[PDB]
Design a protein around this nucleic acid. Structure first.
Lengths: 162, 26, 83, 119, 399
RNA sequence: GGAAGCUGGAAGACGGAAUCGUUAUUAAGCGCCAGGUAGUCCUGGACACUGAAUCC
RNA sequence: UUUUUUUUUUUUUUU
RNA sequence: CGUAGCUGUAGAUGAAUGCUAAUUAUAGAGUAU
RNA sequence: UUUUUUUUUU
């Protein structure tokens, strides 16, 4: 379920997964499928919804309707089920990697906190130092940059178990 | 034009000139 | 390994036993055109050619078997098989 | 997406007619002239009468008839592998239009003399 | 209501809308209504400016019948189908006989039956029954009360072809029959003038008798003396033979007499001319690759004639094409039947109307959070198009 | 020798083991022709677009 | 452009 | 220009493209099943 | 991945 397959004959997209305001929600553009992200025990699991084509003649709501809006309608109804019942809502005690969150790595030549991220093909480096702020203040600021920049471009990053 | 890349190019090229060639296999 | 050639040879002989009929209407798929391709000497091309004289939709489900319907279908196959 | 004619909706295989409204590809041109052979022969006025059997409507749909039509039609769109870049095939309707107009073949829509044109 | 109220949404009851539109919603509105989580929420339709100009014409047309009013159909070219969701329900509420058909192509790209005939028009017995069954769901209580004329009794063939046009197909067969039979009188000079004229006179006498004995049209003998137009229940009983003859009989009946105002609306009219999914042996070499043109069928041909709108003394027709089922391209309007003075070319939604559309979705709990700061930012992204606005906001949280 | 129609029951879903190395418009895909003085390659030369990740 | 259009993009050039 | 976006088919357990009674093109000559 | 036209339908 945590495999990021890349078809050989397909159009490459800069942002395969689109992040939404709702925490437990994510849109996939590669397969035009709607998925929900939640932590379960320890790992990220999703519920892919079919969007392909194939009945009552009253109204085109529910049942066998092969419409692109069916997936969206099936996701909103499922979201309230988890919150109302309170089955699985709990924080991600599963860690990302050694260097805190994904995409952050320590410097080898000296004490620094690098946070690389792409934006319209460009990228940033340097970030904030570590010797001038210690191992606590500098670490806190390193994570704050990634979360703040991802809310503007609507970029979703898959969390790996290792 | 021995492989599937170069050989299929000829069929696709003729499709843009006002002809219809079956595509299907190869 | 070598016994597979002889074992699969029985499948070819089974086709002769299923012969002697105008056309094997029975099939696996719902579409009449797709089922008609199961016969020997017919493929995606000849399958559509036979249906041209039937004056029916491409994906038309096979209708009920009739004595008079078999004669028309069998006659069209011979014309198409000529090439 | 996969339309026929490309972005500019090219059409290098059809010929228009001055009279009426009807167009057909070069594939059907060969069959039309062969079928209407009685009118052409009588217009001018054995070795000369060699294609008489080919005038049959049912013979063209047989295995023998299918090969005769393909032999005359050489598929001008197909050429050598080195014909790349600026050396690309052009519309062959220029030659077909001349023969179709000189032979004085009637149009299926309306019986008329040479009225075909490139288009 | 009026010029002051433009671009507003009118609430509609869920139960009342279904009864008024038994067939279904007009256009792709069914995809947008299912997104609302609330089941008891009403349905709203925007009142575009294009509807105000069309609604006023209908008001004057009704008052005249009680050469100033229009006597021809219109055409929407370019949100053309959005107005249908508001013009049809309103007209039906004013005691108007409206023919609803949002999906006319369903009878041309589905499982059916075709039987070739001498008239050259293919019929569909399976689809012929569904046309009348769906039309009588809401238009009842009026067809039965309407009388039936006596001047148009039974002059239609089995395939709906007229008697005059159907008998013309046999002209070639009868032409050769008389030529061979003329030898009896040809072989018995006298003035060289009267002898030839007398021989020719025999052809006229034989032709008149031959055109009235060989042909035996079916004059709906099942119903000798009708009393109304809705009392034709024998059509629903028999489907193998009497399926298309009754379909055309009602169509012709609704032109001659004038008792009530009528209206016909055919949506997605741009997919009736292109080829159908059927296969036959009527191709002109390579024109169709062995396919039956959609306009060559029975049902599609009935709704593929705009030049006949003049015969509609009761009402008029209307059509619109906005979907992407086929590229419009040039879309010649002169060689189709409509004129350049009867085409309503709508444009993209104005900024004023765009704001209302976004606010409408908020009341329905569709979006999560739509800040006012980015309200105008999204206008340039989708360009204000309705199709690009609903899809863009649906995929993302919106705003 | 190249390509195409028709026909189609040639041998393959084995292995998460192991050997060839990439210093980011790198890697991975897809598309075009210039020369080889008639045709005549899956290699070599040469241009352009989508273009992710890691502790190197 | 409210009688205007009816639409994907390349490897030399408006000196 | 190709994978486009978009949009119909079967949300393929069955898409492997070689074998050949037979023709298309270059060349003086590439033929026989 | 495929559009009508030179006229004989109340």
């Amino acid at each position: 379920r945590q495999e990021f397959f890349w078809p050989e004959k397909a159009r490459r997209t800069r942002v395969p997964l689109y992040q939404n305001s709702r925490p437990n929600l994510v849109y996939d553009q590669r397969f035009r499928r709607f998925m929900c992200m939640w932590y379960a025990n320890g790992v990220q699991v999703f519920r892919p919804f079919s969007c392909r084509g194939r009945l009552p003649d009253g109204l085109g709501i529910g049942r066998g309707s092969g419409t692109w809006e069916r997936a969206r309608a099936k996701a909103v109804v499922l979201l309230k089920q988890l919150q109302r019942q309170g089955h699985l809502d709990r924080l991600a005690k599963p860690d990302v990697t050694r260097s805190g969150v994904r995409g952050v790595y320590f410097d080898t030549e000296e004490k620094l906190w690098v946070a690389t991220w792409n934006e319209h093909g460009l990228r940033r480096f340097k970030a904030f130092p570590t010797m001038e702020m210690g191992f606590d203040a500098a670490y806190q600021a390193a994570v704050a940059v990634r979360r703040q920049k991802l809310r503007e471009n609507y970029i979703f990053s898959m969390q790996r178990n290792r | 034009c021995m492989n599937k890349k170069n050989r299929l190019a000829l069929r696709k090229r003729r499709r843009r000139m006002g002809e219809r060639v079956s595509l299907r296999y190869r | 390994r070598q016994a597979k050639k002889q074992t699969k040879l029985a499948a070819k002989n089974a086709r002769k036993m299923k012969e002697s009929k105008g056309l094997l209407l029975e099939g696996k798929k719902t579409a009449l055109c797709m089922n008609l391709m199961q016969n020997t000497g017919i493929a995606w091309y000849r399958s559509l050619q036979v249906c041209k004289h039937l004056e029916m939709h491409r994906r038309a489900p096979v209708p009920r078997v009739t004595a008079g319907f078999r004669e028309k279908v069998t006659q069209a196959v011979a014309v198409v098989k000529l090439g | 997406a996969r339309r026929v004619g490309g972005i500019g909706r090219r059409c290098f295989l059809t010929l228009h007619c001055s009279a009426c409204s009807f167009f057909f590809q070069t594939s059907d041109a060969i069959k039309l002239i062969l079928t209407q052979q009685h009118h052409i022969l009588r217009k001018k006025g054995a070795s000369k009468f060699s294609l008489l059997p080919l005038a049959d409507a049912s013979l063209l749909l047989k295995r023998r008839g299918a090969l005769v039509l393909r032999s005359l039609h050489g598929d001008p769109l197909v050429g050598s592998r080195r014909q790349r870049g600026e050396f690309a095939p052009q519309a062959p309707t220029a030659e077909m239009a001349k023969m179709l107009n000189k032979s004085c073949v009637p149009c299926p829509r309306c019986k008329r003399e040479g009225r075909w044109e490139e288009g | 209501v009026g010029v002051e109220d433009v671009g507003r949404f009118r609430l509609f009851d869920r139960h009342r809308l279904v009864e008024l539109l038994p067939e279904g919603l007009a256009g792709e509105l069914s995809r947008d209504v299912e997104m609302i989580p609330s089941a008891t929420s009403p349905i709203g339709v925007m009142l575009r400016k294009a509807t105000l100009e069309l609604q006023m014409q209908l008001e004057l047309f009704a008052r005249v019948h009680a050469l100033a009013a229009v006597q021809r159909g219109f055409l929407l070219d370019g949100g053309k189908s959005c107005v249908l969701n508001y013009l049809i329900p309103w007209a039906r509420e004013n005691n108007w006989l409206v023919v609803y058909e949002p999906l006319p192509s369903r009878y041309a790209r589905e499982i059916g039956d075709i039987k070739r005939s001498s008239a050259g028009v293919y019929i569909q017995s399976s689809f012929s029954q569904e046309f009348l069954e769906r039309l009588g769901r809401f238009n009842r209580r009026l067809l039965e009360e309407l009388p039936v004329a006596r001047r148009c009794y039974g002059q239609a063939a089995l395939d709906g072809v007229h008697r005059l046009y159907a008998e013309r197909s046999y002209h070639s067969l009868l032409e050769k029959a008389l030529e061979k039979d003329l030898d009896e009188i040809r072989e018995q000079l006298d003035s060289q003038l009267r002898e030839e004229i007398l021989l020719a006179r025999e052809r006229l006498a034989l032709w008149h008798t031959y055109r009235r004995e060989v042909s035996i049209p079916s004059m709906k003998s099942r119903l000798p003396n009708p009393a109304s137009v809705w009392e034709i229940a024998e059509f629903g009983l028999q489907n193998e033979a009497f399926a298309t003859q009754a379909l055309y009989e009602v169509w012709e009946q609704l032109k001659k007499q004038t008792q009530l105002n009528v209206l016909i609306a055919v949506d997605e009219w741009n997919e009736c001319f292109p080829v159908s999914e059927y296969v036959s042996m009527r191709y002109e070499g390579t024109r169709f690759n062995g396919h039956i043109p959609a306009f060559h069928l029975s049902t599609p041909r009935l709704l593929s004639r705009f030049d006949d709108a003049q015969q509609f003394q009761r009402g008029l027709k209307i059509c619109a094409t906005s979907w992407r089922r086929s590229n419009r391209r040039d879309y010649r309007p002169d060689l189709l039947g409509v004129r350049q003075e009867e085409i309503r070319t709508v444009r993209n939604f104005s900024p004023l109307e765009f704001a209302n559309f976004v606010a409408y979705y908020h009341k329905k709990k569709i979006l999560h959070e739509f800040p006012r700061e980015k309200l105008d930012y999204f206008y340039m992204l989708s360009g204000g198009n309705g199709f690009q606005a609903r899809r863009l906001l649906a995929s993302l949280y919106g705003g």
